[PDB]
């Protein structure tokens with residue numbers, strides 16, 4: 001019933017990116033029908049989306065109906081474009097960040113912005129992060145779980161984490177670029193299994209890569225309840241203890257010592273799962289998020305949290321808003 | 333403290349498989365040092381193992397020390413060899429199954445056998461299953477989470493499931509053949525993340541492929557606590573409801589209706605994780621298993637279960653032995 005850390009939005013329209021940059025592989029939005037649009041990647045339709053995916057007015061009406069005060073807006077992850085030339089990804093980043101900032105200016109009490117960065121080129125990413133924070137006024141950014149062959153332990157990314165600490169810029173980590181073909185081409189497995197696995201790999205990578213140890217002021221929240229991590233943390237912690245030759249060469253402290261060091265959203269659908277999440281991650285560390293407007297999201301925002309007889313009213317309030325305001329560094 | 337459904341053993345020695353079959357890619361055991369051996373795949377050492385991995389006498393002494401009455405013995409999963417020619421995999425299967433049956437005959441009150449099958453060729457697999465059950469006296473078999481490009485929903489495998497129902501042959505499903513290279517080549521991620529993801533994909537595949545619906549007498553137990561499934565079942569069940577076009581074309585019943593239809597081992601390391609597992613899978617459906625003699629296993633077998641103040645003595649007894657005896661169809 002309060003703040004939603006996890007929601008995705010796109011521009012109304014954007015330019016032909018293939019023409020702008022000189023090579024294909026990019027995505028485009030095609031308005032085929034009233035209140036309806038297609039996303040495509042060279043020719044092929046790969047997703048159908050509704051009006052509420054780009055129209056702030058439509059979003060405000062649906063938020064009102066559901067009792068949601070603020071959405072944190074970030075782009076659709078397929079727009080990350082970490083695969084492209086660094087300056088072209090940055091150019092697209094500036095376009096999506098400015099779009100997002102425009103929307104925020106129009107409804108500054110209903111939205112805040114999480115920008116996107118050219119993470120494959122750390123010098124450009126630092127510079128675009130500095131702009132989002134100093135000029136656009138964003139409290140943080142949304143990044144993917146890996147960047148081409150870099151997982152988030154990668155030393156090449158340390159300048160980005162350092163910039164985040166100095167700028168007080170929060171990081172929302174979202175699974176993306178999962179395997180889509182072969183055995184994963186059935187039963188929606190990329191979204192149902194691939195996403196949570198991507199998130200668990202990101203949490204393990206930042207832990208065992210020493211990111212939380214070296215950048216102790218960095219604020220990070222992972223999407224979809226930490227993936228499998230809240231349930232498989234015992235396996236991970238035990239395995240680290242047993243094979244330090246494999247697990248401890250970048251950071252010798254046991255993963256368990258980092259519980260309390262980062263946030264997750266609360267998007268885990270079931271009450272038994274939400275209770276384990278808070279038991280493991282902490283009542284101060286779980287943030288209502290919805291994945292609005294996508295179907296895999298929570299249909300009645302805040303309902304799972306409010307349905308927990310195990311939680312007092314002060315805990316519910318932390319989960320619904322107070323934790324988001326802490327993670328984002330924003331006034332209650 | 334009772335029965336261990338999940339333990340791996342190899343023969344003392346076996347022939348040069350490359351010479352036997354006429355092409356490389358197979359594994360071999362090399363005794364380099366006292367009570368020590370190397371596993372290799374063409375030249376390269378990929379694992380070091382101890383005596384207790386092949387010597388039944390050593391295993392009995394370590395079981396006594398730990399209060400373990402019976403181990404269910406199955407081969408090391410890298411021996412599956414589903415990639416090879418069908419008759420060659422079957423020939424190796426017969427050798428490993430006979431080895432296992434010999435060991436069982438020598439200590440028939442301490443061991444039972446779970447055989448291995450040429451799953452890439454279903455007619456041969458049915459025939460070797462019939463032999464393990466009728467001639468070798470095995471109560472079940474261990475199979476992998478996928479078979480080359482077949483996940484376990486594959487219709488080509490239905491004759492194997494049908495044979496299992498008729499023969500009353502239990503199936504222990506073990507994750508294997510994970511990605512090992514690229515981004516997964518660090519931090520032991522194949523074992524810490526890849527294995528649980530493989531298991532969740534296998535549980536989803538058998539559910540949404542209608543395997544439990546079409547073969548309701550089939551007994552199946554998945555390794556490592558069901559992977560992520562006990563925590564991500566809400567995500568999976570919600571997603572199935574939202575996109576039946578993606579999820580329900582082979583079996584329209586919601587995955588949640590199958591909780592209670594299969595078993596898992598109890599190998600989840602942490603007490604919060606063991607409580608969620610029983611809450612989700614059922615107190616009648618969780619089986620003490622250890623992954624003996626591998627380091628990622630439980631070091632004091634049965635200790636997690638016995639440490640649960642939430643469980644009465646009758647529940648502990650089910651988890652330590654009664655559930656295994658039910659899954660295997662064996663006399664208490």
Ligand SMILES: [Zn+2]
Pocket residue numbers: 006008174223291
């Ligand atoms: Zn999302």
Ligand SMILES: [Zn+2]
Pocket residue numbers: 338340506555623
């Ligand atoms: Zn095992």
